[PDB]
Design a protein around this nucleic acid. Sequence first.
RNA 1: UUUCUUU
RNA 2: GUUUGCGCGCCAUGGGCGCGCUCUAACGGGUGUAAGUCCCGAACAUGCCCAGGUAGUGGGAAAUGUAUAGCCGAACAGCAAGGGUGUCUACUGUGAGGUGGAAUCUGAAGGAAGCUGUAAGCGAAUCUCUGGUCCGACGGACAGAAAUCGCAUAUAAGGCUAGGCUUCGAGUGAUAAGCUGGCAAAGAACAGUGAAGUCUAAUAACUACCAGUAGAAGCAGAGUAAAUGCGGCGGAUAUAUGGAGAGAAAGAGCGUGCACCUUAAGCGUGGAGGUCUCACAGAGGUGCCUAGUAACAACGAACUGUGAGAAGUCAGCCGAGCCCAUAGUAGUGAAGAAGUCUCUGUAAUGGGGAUGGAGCGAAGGGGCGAACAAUCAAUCAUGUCUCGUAUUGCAGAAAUGACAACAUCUGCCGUAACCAAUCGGGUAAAAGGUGGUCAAAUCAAGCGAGACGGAAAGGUAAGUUGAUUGAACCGCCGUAUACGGAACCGUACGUACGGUGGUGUGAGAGGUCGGAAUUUCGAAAUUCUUCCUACUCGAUUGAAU
Length: 388
Amino acid sequence: SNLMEQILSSDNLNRAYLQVVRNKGAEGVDGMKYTELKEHLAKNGETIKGQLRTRKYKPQPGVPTVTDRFIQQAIAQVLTPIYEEQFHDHSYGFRPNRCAQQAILTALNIMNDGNDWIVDIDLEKFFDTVNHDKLMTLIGRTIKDGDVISIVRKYLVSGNLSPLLANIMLNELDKEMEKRGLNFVRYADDCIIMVGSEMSANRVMRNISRFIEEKLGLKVNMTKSKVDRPSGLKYLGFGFYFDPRAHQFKAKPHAKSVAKFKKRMKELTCRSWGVSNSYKVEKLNQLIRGWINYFKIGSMKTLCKELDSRIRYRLRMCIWKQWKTPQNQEKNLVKLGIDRNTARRVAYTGKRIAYVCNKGAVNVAISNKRLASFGLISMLDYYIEKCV
RNA sequence: UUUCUUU
RNA sequence: GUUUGCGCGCCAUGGGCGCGCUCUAACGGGUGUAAGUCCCGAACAUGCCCAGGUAGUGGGAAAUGUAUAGCCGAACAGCAAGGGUGUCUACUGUGAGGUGGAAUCUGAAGGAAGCUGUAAGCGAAUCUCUGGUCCGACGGACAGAAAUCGCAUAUAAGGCUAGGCUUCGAGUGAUAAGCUGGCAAAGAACAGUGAAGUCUAAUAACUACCAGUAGAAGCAGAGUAAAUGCGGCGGAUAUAUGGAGAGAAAGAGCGUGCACCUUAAGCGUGGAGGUCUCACAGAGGUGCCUAGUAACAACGAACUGUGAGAAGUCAGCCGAGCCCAUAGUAGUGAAGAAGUCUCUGUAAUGGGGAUGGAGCGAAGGGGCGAACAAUCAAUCAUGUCUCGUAUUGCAGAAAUGACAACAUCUGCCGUAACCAAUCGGGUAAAAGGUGGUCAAAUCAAGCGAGACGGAAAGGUAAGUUGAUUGAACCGCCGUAUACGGAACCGUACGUACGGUGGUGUGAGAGGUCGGAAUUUCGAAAUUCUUCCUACUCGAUUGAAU
Ligand SMILES: [Ca+2]
Ligand SMILES: [Ca+2]
Ligand SMILES: [Ca+2]
Ligand SMILES: [Ca+2]
Ligand SMILES: [Ca+2]
Ligand SMILES: [Ca+2]
Ligand SMILES: [Ca+2]
Ligand SMILES: [Ca+2]
Ligand SMILES: [Ca+2]
Ligand SMILES: [Ca+2]
Ligand SMILES: [Ca+2]
Ligand SMILES: [Ca+2]
Ligand SMILES: [Ca+2]
Ligand SMILES: [N+]
Ligand SMILES: [N+]
C-alpha cells in the first residue's frame, strides 16, 4: 500500500543498501557478504518486495542476517519521520544529528538551573523485558498501515530498527515526564531526572519506578537505580563536579572512563609489541583523537597534562626497548645528542628500563619535542584546540 | 644512571 | 643462513688407580709414643666503634690481611700460531685459481689440549645439626609426555620504584652464603639489605670545620612486566655454599708406571655429489666463437661426450629403510669381527659372559620412501497451505454507576541574631497548589497467539583407498663427551645417539609465468595472489611482518 511503497521505494532501498555498505557489517546466522547482498538484491529484490507487500516474509536469527539488516534499515529510514517529529527535545540518543555531548550539556544546564538532586534510573535489559503487545499498540497508535506493523512484529518475535523501537517505548516515558513537569536528560535507556530536594527526589524515584513497572511494563533494576547528587553520578561516561566558584556544575571524564583510556593506552604502548613505534604512535593518535572528540566538553586540563606525561614516558620505554642492545642504545643516544661519555653509561644500564626512561639522558634525547616531531599529538594542545 | 658479558 | 662445526687415525700437556720423594698453619712454643690435625703467646696496617654531621689525631669488642704447603687466573691486561675480507697489492698460471706482502676484523663457551703477569677467590678424612640456593623437564604452567605434589596466576597474581597516611620509635654491633635494584632470562660489577647459628657487647676524647629524628611495622592507592609465585615432600650442594659441634683426620707439589680411560678449533689423511675452468674430437654460429643474465625459466649457435684439472663441503625440526659415487676403499679386526646361545638394563638408545673362525666398515650432497601429524576428495509425528467454527493478547470511543479519594509535582520544622548535620529531629518531615478517580454493558481499527476440524501433500558413516601440505624455527630431558661460570643461564636443541611438546610459510628481485580479473582474441599486456630459489636485504634470545 501507500506507506509500504514508501518503505519500498527505489531511492529509499538504494539509500538503505548504501547505508548498510557504509556500516561494513558482518554475516548473520547463515553467512553472506554485503557484495553478496548486492547480487542478492540484483537477482532476488523483487521477490523480497513482493513478500513484504504480501505479508509472507519470515525473519532469520547476536546479529541479524544482512538481508534483514537491509530491510530493517529501509523501515528505519521511513519511520524516523513522524516519530522524530513526535519525540521529545531531551531524547538525545540514537537519533539523527543528536549526540551524547548535547545530552551532557543539557544536563549541565539543568544542573546549573537549580536542580541538583539526581534520580538515576537503570532500566535493565530493555529489549527482552518489554511486552510486545504494548509496543505494537503504540506503533499502531501512530501509523495505520497493517503491513509495516506486521513486519516489525515479526522482527520483534525474531539492527538499526531496535534503537528506534527503544526510543518509541521510552518516548512514552518522556511524554509522561513532560506531563508531570519534571526536568530530565535521556540518552537511550539512560535517563536521569533532576529534582530540587532529596526527599522529593526519592518520591519521584518511587513514582516513576511505579509508572515504569506498571504502565510500560518494564523492570527497574533497583540495585543500580539510585538517588544522587551530581558527584557520584556516572552518565554517558561523564562524571560531574562543583567548582569552588559558586556558579556552575561542570562535566569531567569519570574515573572509570579514565581507567578505560589508561588501559587502552597501556595496551597500545606495550614495550614488547613487535611493530614499529610509528605504528604505536599512529594508534595512540587515533585513540587520543577519539577520546578527546568524545569528552572535549568536560574539563580535563590537569588530567590531559598527566596523561600526556604518562604517554610520553611509555613511548620512551617503547623506543628504548626497540633499540634492544647496549651498543645500539649508545649509538642512538650519541646520534640524538647526548654526549658519548654519558651515553655509554646510560646505555650499559640496558636493563632497568623504567629507571633510565624515567629521567636523565633518555628524557633529554627522546624529549617532548622529538616525540611531537615523531607524530605523537599531545593530549593537552589537542584538547586546547578542540575545546570551546 | 653498571663507561660489562651472553642467550 | 652461518668465525669453526664431516669421516678415519694419532697424541695427553685432562682424568683414574698404584708407588716413591719432599712439604703443610707468620715466627715459635708446649701438650703427646707420634701434630699437618689439639692448644697457647706478639705486634702491624685495614674494617667497625668512641657517633650525635663529615674530614685528622689519640684510642677500643668482635672480623679480615701480611701469614699453610699449594690451587686457581677475572665479564683483567700483554704476547699470540692460525682463520676471514665485492679491500690495496707484487709474483704465478691458458684459466678456474694458487702463493707472498700491507690494511682491518678475529684468535671463539666445546684440543696452538694456546703462553706470561696479576686483582679477587679458594685451600684438609669422616659424622651430626642447620641456613641459603638449585633440581625433581618443557608447556600463561592444560592436553600430550618417561618426567614432584597442591593451590594461585593476565582486569594483569607476584616482585620492584617513588611517594602518602596512621600507630610505634633511635641506639648493640660484627661475621655473609643469598635476596633485591620498577621486571624476557642468566652471569659479572657497584650499591642496599641480609637467613642460620656463632662471636661480641668494650673504649676515653679533643683540634679545626658543618647543622623528637633515623628506621620498621600496617593500610589504601599510583607507576612498572616477552610470568611465574607460594607452600609440602624428596634429592644435590668442592662458586672447595653460610655456619655450628665432635674429630691424632689428611691435604698439597713433583717424579714414575699402566698391554688404564677420554677429548670438537692440535697433527696427519680423505673427500664423492654437485659447481667451475681448460684442452681434444664431434654438433652448430660467423680462419674465429659456446657463454652470459645469482640459480630455475627464457633469448639466442651456445650444445654434448671424453681427458686433465681448481675451489670446496660438513644446521635437530615428517623420515625407519633403500639407491648414485669416494668405496666394499681408507680405517678397524687374531689383544676375537659377523653369526649363535645365555644372564641381565632402560621410557628408548644398552651392557657383560661362552662358543666362532674371519668379517665389520665411513665422510658431504641429492633422489626414492615405509611410518607419524593434520587437511581434502573418492569409496563404503511436527511442520506447512487453504477454508473454517468457538475463542483469545493488546488500542480507542462511551450509555450507566459508586466514592470524593486518589494520582501528581515546588518539600522543612523550632532556633539562633539568624547554624544545609554548620544547632536537635526527619527523610511518603509540615504547610502546600495542580488534575477528581475507578468500573466501563455495548460497539470497534489492526497485527497476532494458539484450540477443535474438514481439507494439498510428506517423512548413512566408521572403516578403507589415494592425492597434497609438514618451508623454516623455539626449546627441553636421559646417557657419553667437552667448555664459559659450580648451580642457574648458555656454547647451533653445545655436539653424537635416544625420547618429547610448541609456532606454521619475512621483504625485494628472478622464474612458475598456474589462480583472479580489466583490454583485445582459457592466448598477449597490466595489477594482487598460490608455487620454486640462502641471489640481494631484514633479523637474530624468542615472537612480530
Ligand atoms: Ca641460541
Ligand atoms: Ca691476592
Ligand atoms: Ca631446567
Ligand atoms: Ca615454565
Ligand atoms: Ca602488581
Ligand atoms: Ca668464606
Ligand atoms: Ca678453546
Ligand atoms: Ca682440489
Ligand atoms: Ca624440514
Ligand atoms: Ca630465528
Ligand atoms: Ca638451558
Ligand atoms: Ca638460536
Ligand atoms: Ca657459535
Ligand atoms: N657455520
Ligand atoms: N634449536
